[PDB]
Structures are given as C-alpha cells and as structure tokens.
C-alpha cells in the first residue's frame, strides 16, 4: 500500500497558469529513469488545447532524495540543475558536496529505497537552512615543435598591409585570437557592428578560426558590405615602421585585421596541430613586436 499513498511532486512552472487541471493517474506506468522500478505515472496538459502532454519521468522517492521536480528534474526551490546546485553550495561552504549516481543496475535499485537523502537536497529542502546560504551568496557578490618548419605557410599570410579603405576583396585576415572566444561571438559582433541581424540565414559572411594557430580568416559576400565593415572599425594601431591594422573589440581581448586579397584554403593556417602550435609561437613574438 506504499505505492499509491505518497503524493506527486510537480513544480509551479511545469503546471502552468490554468485554474484547475485534470490529470491522469496510472498506477503501474513506466519505470523510473533513475531507479528503474515501476511507479505511478501522471499525465497532464497545461492548457486544455496544448500540443504536448507532460509526463512524470522519475518516481516520487527518487525526486524526494534529490528535492527535484518529477518532470523538470530541476530543483524544487531554486529551479536550477543538480549539476549547478552542488557547485554553488560548494562555494558557500569550504567542503565539496556532490550527488553521486549508481552505475550498477541493481545498486541503483538498492539506492532508491533508503529514506535518508543525498547531495545539496539536505540544505535546499529546509527553508531556514537554505536562506543562510543565499544570504552568504550576497557577501560573495560584495567580494566581487620548433623542429617542424612553417615557412611556406608564413609567406601566404599578408603580414604587412593596411586599411587602405579600398574595395580590394571580401577577404580579410584576423589574428591575436586566443584560446577562448567561440566563433559565433566573433560573427555576432561583426554582424552587430555592421548592423545586420540574423547573419547566418543571409549567408553574408564566412569565418574560419583555427583556435590552435591563434589566427582567423574572414570572408564576406556582396563586397559592398565589406568596405562598410571597415567603415565601422574605429580603433587603429599605426605600427611605427609598419602598416596600420584595424582592431576588433571583444571584451578584454584584441583582434587585429589585415585585408587578405589572396588568402583562403584551410592549409593556410596549418596542416596538423603541432604546425599550428609553432605558428602560435610565431605570432606571439610578432604581437609583442607590434605593441612594443
């Protein structure tokens, strides 16, 4: 009689805005994604005319031990993933606390019947205990390779050119890109600075960033967009006995620009990975030369 007596665990976000919702109870529905035991399952639709039926995926015993919604698998108090909720509590306390998972099919079956609890749920279930840690969150917010030769590649790189502001080509050269900064954030700011939203469906611009050579290659379409890109680049460095470069300004990181006019084709940055690591060290000297 232990099957049908404990009540369900649905958060207010899954359940919706509707006044009174009809649900369907099935006493031996699916089995639990966590414990792999049969349990009573619940159907509901948020509105009466939804396209999608919401289904309880885990049982109530496995949800109580993690203090989570049976559908979201998110926290019942904070609505955050378990992969995050342990890491935030591991910052407030100097101890490290986690939710361990059983790999073996019978040991995960053994694990669900014990009525203790585990992970951060022993904090997040109590209202008084969980408030002290959210209080301490505020105080933290108050606290605020040489042997391989790369020469044939380095001649193709247009090391010595300017923003001459001529039409030239669609093609440009980027470098000083560091091990960070995914390619979408580059192509977003270039689209944000040029002004066009939804760059990808128009297919106006093309990017290649190698991320091991630390350099990047840019292509446009419809060349009148290309000079408008140069028309928006304000920051410059006039190198002392050299040719000027325009600078992209992502947060805290600087990307310097040369018009290509002959560059393309992958091999341009390096064939293997070690050949890119050697080119990383080649440009690291040249960027130090460029600033000082």
């Amino acid at each position: 009689d232990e099957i049908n007596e404990p009540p369900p665990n649905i958060c207010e976000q899954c359940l919706g805005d509707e006044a009174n919702i009809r649900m369907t109870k099935i006493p031996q529905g699916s089995e639990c994604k966590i414990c792999t035991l049969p349990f009573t399952l619940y159907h509901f639709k948020t509105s009466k005319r939804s396209n999608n039926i919401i289904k309880t995926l885990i049982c109530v015993r496995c949800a109580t031990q993690r203090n989570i919604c049976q559908c979201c698998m998110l926290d019942s108090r904070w609505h955050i993933p378990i992969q995050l909720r342990d890491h935030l509590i591991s910052l407030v306390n100097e101890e490290n606390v986690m939710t361990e998972e059983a790999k073996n099919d019978m040991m995960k079956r053994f694990l669900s019947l014990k009525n203790v609890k585990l992970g951060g749920a022993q904090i997040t279930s109590d209202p008084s205990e969980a408030d002290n840690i959210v209080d301490k969150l505020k105080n933290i917010l108050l606290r605020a390779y040489a042997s391989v030769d790369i020469s044939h590649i380095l001649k193709k790189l247009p090391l010595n050119e300017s923003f001459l502001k001529n039409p030239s080509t669609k093609s440009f050269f980027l470098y000083n890109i560091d091990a960070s900064i995914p390619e979408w954030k580059i192509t977003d700011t270039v689209s944000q600075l040029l002004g066009i939203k939804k760059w990808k469906d128009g297919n106006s611009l093309s990017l290649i960033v190698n991320h091991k050579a630390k350099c990047g290659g840019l292509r446009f379409q419809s060349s009148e967009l290309g000079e408008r890109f140069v028309s928006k680049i304000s920051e410059t460095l006039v190198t002392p006995k050299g040719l000027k470069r325009g600078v992209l300004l992502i947060d805290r990181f600087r990307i310097f620009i040369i018009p290509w006019s002959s560059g393309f084709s992958a091999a341009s940055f390096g064939t293997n990975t070690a050949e890119n690591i050697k080119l990383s060290l080649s440009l690291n000297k040249l960027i130090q030369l460029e600033l000082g």
Partner: protein, 45 residues
C-alpha cells in the same frame, strides 16, 4: 492551482500493468533504531 485525478480506461487486450515484470529487489534495512537486548563445564561439554 488545483488537481483533478482521473483514472484512464484500459484496452482489455493490452498487457495490463505494462510496467509489470518479474524482478528481484534486494531491500535495505528498515529505518527504525535498534532495541536494547536487555539480558569445569568446558571439559563436560
């Protein structure tokens, strides 16, 4: 909100209790604490 619980009517030809299958489950120790126990010849025996 509110919750109205409705049992769905099953196809009589379908395998009723689609979760039901013979399985072995080793069960943990029950939660209640332990009760106190309260309580020559070797050459003969």
């Amino acid at each position: 909100h509110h919750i109205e619980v409705v049992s769905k009517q099953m196809d009589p030809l379908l395998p009723r209790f689609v979760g039901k299958k013979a399985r072995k489950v080793v069960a943990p120790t029950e939660n209640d604490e332990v009760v106190p126990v309260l309580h020559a010849d070797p050459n003969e025996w």
